[PDB]
Assembly symmetry: D6
Homo-oligomer: 166 residues x 12
């Protein structure tokens, strides 16, 4: 029995071990450097930030990953989605379940009108999952990011509520 | 021997488990996202806020739910009432007792002149419980709240103090 | 005419408007507020996104105030309030202000519904609201208290769907 | 041609001259020592205090006095009333009209159920004025205050809204 | 061996269980709602408030109740007295002992000139104890308070030092 | 005879008049509501924010508009560019020259690797101006913004430093 | 004449009075205090109820200062201090100020005793105090230090009972 | 082997037990009310106050009392001395030793020119102990303090440094 | 299996033992005085300072050293590198690995254009290790630092990113 | 002429100097700084002892700025920076300012070495520095970035020993 | 016709012009760099500092200099004395009279037991002036100060109150 | 194996027991009064004070004493030295070792030009050790200090780096 659960201070430990993994942050276009103190400080800082919602993906036993609906805009009604499953629990389908849960949350609870995301052009697995869920590649930002010593392009993908209610 | 009690900082745990349940908060038209840190922050924030009176409902042994009096207006002499009972204790009559005690408190302690509440038009159970306590439907708010991906209609039920002493 | 963002420099006018016993009765508001309290609340809710307070002005001077309050960004609803100075009454300012406010609420704030509370005895305001499409969705008996009497309130509202027709 | 207004910071000057007159403050049982700095500090400190409401009484041309509804209790619905007309405007009936308007404010706007006040027993003028407005003596506190070198007694007068509507 | 002992933070627990009892607060004209956090906040707030003195009545073993000399005025030399004995330890004479101790403290230590109190007109037991100690009913405030859904009158009683030194 | 300058507090007045024009802010997808107090607060809050750089565009005699390099990322080396020329100075080519100088600043001084921007799809004038400067459309975000009563689409245009040096 | 509540605007005068080597010697005080320090202490003790600082003024301008200090509300005693500008000396201002201060201390502050320290060599001040009923209750030898010498101090005092006779 | 020590935060406990005793504080003309929280607050408040030097008196095993040098004036070179010894250790000569050590500290460390103290005219024991140490009566303060419901007279005893070196 | 990690608050202990060693800090031209409290204060101070990237070097079991990237300039795209390895782990090749990982991080994560370092002209070991990694001597700073009572000369070694990709 | 302590009132000039694209290029600095940011940094580093910022002025008005920065009090070194307004170029102000700054650094701050970074292409500045005794101790290739190009930098320096000869 | 006065904020301007003259500050061994902002900050910071006393020396018409009694130790009763007469008022004897008045203040008002001062060994004028007032050299600190390019020596002169009363 | 080690908060305990010993502080001209709370407050206050450096002298086992390089001046390049060895560990030569270590630190690390100290004229042992290390009596401050009821003279001694490098 899996579930997405509001991120907690106590969970930051896991997230820390998740945010300092080069392999993971590279695909996320992030940096693999974030002291636990910095993570706790940002958690306290954005505690009441209504432009964010950070969920923890947990199965029947342990926490397996994290999802995040960030940059939530309540005028344009859109937000960015981003998932990170621990490499140890990869392949179990956690990513797809958590992605579906997050889309449902954004469309049926936050009353969003459009979800979007940034993915690496070479990361065909994530693009495959997204296109399976409904996201369409709306843009190719060439050399938009810089990771592993290379300027990487990125697909700006997105999914409209009108295309999900159908 | 059921009773109402003042919401304490230690009870937040229970309240947290209550505020992060999709099904429970759907009836309140509320969002089921709220970290324990956020709940504690809001508790310490409204500690002295006299416009609220949050209660814990507890039977002889455990805590079962939470009844709250909010938007307490001391000029117009009215306030909104909101009751929740943990689903695992449903059907045991705790909701009726909690609502009775809350009405008694609002009318005979806060010297309120009127009580009101918002209920989902489809929630026939809660509607019946409120009617049995004297509340009358004063208006139908169409598409007033957005939950489970749909704009739900809401009855604005209310009970005057004069209607209550009869 | 035009609606404008409420400015600190305007509070004076608002002050003169918020301490009038006749004007604030239609709002069910208490007609007491020092300029210092008004300035303190202005600074307090400067970044409060649940509020949008507008000044209504004509060719020359300021004539009134509008306010989109209790803006809920999940349910997509908000209360609207309008007050035109009595010295400018009957000139049609209230209707223009209400129209501009509805346009701002629906086409800029992306709202799904606009509601308001009006005194049951205030026939002129009820007619103005109905002419703009607002439909009474309830009657709150003895909801407010002003001039020593418990006044009932019509909860009027307008859906964005009923507005694009 | 005499109204009540909200007390403003700019008015404190006037009020200052009143709070330092021994003859005036004695009737209030107060101390005639209050620097303008202390007065401004108190004004700023009780700016948002809802248990108070200090009105300025002004005639057709100038400011003439101050009324005040203090200790406003929103549970028992009782407020104390105080009044001071500058000695130079005595005999023009300002006290009567200002007290009447303050009663009307306390009852018809603040929705209070009872107004009360303390009046020096030797001040028969104020007692007569209050009785004309419908106040009835409910007690005599003896040696309750100390001023002008002696423990002075005060009548606790009050008026119910029911007695006023008649 | 009984004694009144300066209220301590550690004692607040008891006081909390004492201040949330409807039966007790009703006669005290208070409200039976005060979270332990609110109580601790008010204790810290009024730690240096020289207008108060809150004693705990304790017998040879457990704490039995509380006394309070509040609204202490050092110009008029008067203060309000209020006692609350737990219903479990009622009838043991604790109230009379603590009342005598508090009067002695106010008159011989704080150098007060007059003690006073508010009691319910229907609470003949408290009035009996007070009149036994020396207090005389100086006023009847009609409908001064609101509790248990009714506007209750109250005796303003008081005792002068001149009537106690004799 | 047209230059860029650093945005100053004294200039906010001008900027204020721009941030409250619905017609101007619509193209930016912004809200035309920003009190001068809020604008000054934001200016002071982002004073030392290195992710921003707000330039004032002025001609030979007066101030005519504002350019801005925002979201300056010093890892991926990409910055968003925004421009507003007051409507009364339209048709004099100010937008072209100011945008050119801003490109030169972003590349030759901030050492940025790519500049990007969002432009309403219905605003063919801005698209033509940007294309003249070397920008190429990289994506079409559909129903990404909400203004003038509709979910409007925006082109994500951008320019690489390599394409610019040519 | 009149005593008045000390006001911030008066500190200038007080400053000119607190930096005079001759005046502050009768008080056993150091004649050094910047206007900034005086204003800071004014703001500090604004709400200090153990202090009551009065300005003494005649028909026209300010002439001196009085101070009821160390007010203990349990023992009902307080120290009194009086300083009249030398340019107004011999005009009888000190006696009026002392009288008004005693009246304020007994009939407004409900005090039981008023004490003061006076230099043993200051005969004029001792006579003024005795004329007002103050009786020497002790001699503090080498209590204070001024003008390079350890001066003794008479601790004079007056009971409210001895004042109502 | 008795000794004096600097008052520490941990000793406050003892001091608390000492400051809440009616009999002990009556000699000091002090009030026997002081919560431990208030004592700790005053300790942290005067931590750096150089006008005080509070000491703990301790014999070979336990703490027995407290001697204090207050109102230390560095211009006039004087200070008040106040000694207390727990009654259960009375008659054991601890007071004489503590007073000797305090005088030694005041004269030979703080370079004081004079020491003084207030004693109750009826307290013949303390008067004798002070006289045996060199203090002389310089004045009789009638009705200077109020304790046990009576205005007590006080001797102002003092000792000059010149009288002490003989 | 050696690795680099983000410096954490718990590691400061080790770092403290490292920063108070005369021999170790002499090579860095640093002073070997720094209380643990001071180190923790500096850590909490620069927690969000993006101009620094302090790393812990750890082998399969224990922590062995610390490599740091400081003075990170995002306009000129350069930063200083500073490596330390505990002497008890010297000669085990940890320094080479740490320097390689630090260069990789600086060039392939922070998108740096150049790395530089200050080394003692007499420290032939560190000079050789830096040369083997591609650094070249760009200048000799005579008497630039003062350690062990002598003004030492320092080589300013550096490595360009272009020289690194070959 | 004279060097003077930088004063808040001077920031205006400094502002006009710090937002010039041509001047700040010789410094490798970004030519962007609002007067508010400059005042905030002035207040921030008011007591920063690692900084000594001087105004260079002639008979009449201000003409430039000097700055002894990164002052290390253990190694006894510090960087020096000099900027003269272009409108006063060629008048010899830079040389006088540099001389006075070296004198201040060695004879007042007790420094052991004064270093600086200069653009390899800036021949005039290099000659001015060498005339004052500064000797190139290194060449930092592609150290700075300005006007779209990575510029190399000569790290010139002068020891106090080489200065007393 | 020359007196000492308390240093005022308005005087700082004058003092500023003094604290930036190399020739004047050299004798004090101070640095001639102090912005008016820093001077005002220090004045406000040491406003209540009792270890200082900065006097302004003024003649019959204008301000001419500054004296200062610093490092006032109230245990050892020693204070350092410093003086500066503006160079334009040299030769008029102001230094002598101001120093004399400062000595009188330190001894007869501050009850100090000894005054001390540091004077550059090359400044024979100041040494002569101090000797005329009764100061005697107690030591020669060699290379104790650094100014004008050299480690300068200073005489530590001082005067005892006993030597002064003679 | 002895060593000087940067003072730590945890060490304050020892230092406390060291700073309240009359025998020790007397020779140090200090006062034997410093609550542990005051010591901790001063430690936190001067944590970043670069004008100080407080070392703890510890042998192979326990902490034996403390050294302190205070009043460090980086313009004049001089500082005061002061050592305190516990009387229990006296005679073991700890003082000489720690003094040599501190002189080496001041001259070779802090790059000082001159160390100095104040010693009692009658304390021939400390003067002997100092003169053995190199310090020369540069001044005799007569009655500069006050301890044990007597005005004590003090040798101002000092040692130049030029006299130590030889």
């Amino acid at each position: 029995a899996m579930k997405l659960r509001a991120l907690e201070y106590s969970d930051l430990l896991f997230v820390h071990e998740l945010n300092n993994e080069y392999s993971i942050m590279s695909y996320w276009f992030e940096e693999p450097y974030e002291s636990l103190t910095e993570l706790q400080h940002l958690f306290d800082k954005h505690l009441l930030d209504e432009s964010e919602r950070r969920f923890i993906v947990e199965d029947e036993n342990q926490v397996v990953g994290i999802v995040e609906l960030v940059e939530i805009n309540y005028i344009h009604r859109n937000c960015e989605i981003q998932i990170i499953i621990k490499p140890e629990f990869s392949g179990k389908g956690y990513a797809k379940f958590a992605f579906e849960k997050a889309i449902i949350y954004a469309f049926n609870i936050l009353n969003m009108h459009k979800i979007y995301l940034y993915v690496d052009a070479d990361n065909k697995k994530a693009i495959h999952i997204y296109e399976s869920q409904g996201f369409k590649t709306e843009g190719l930002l060439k050399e938009q990011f810089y990771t592993k010593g290379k300027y990487k392009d990125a697909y700006f993908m997105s999914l409209l509520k009108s295309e999900y209610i159908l």
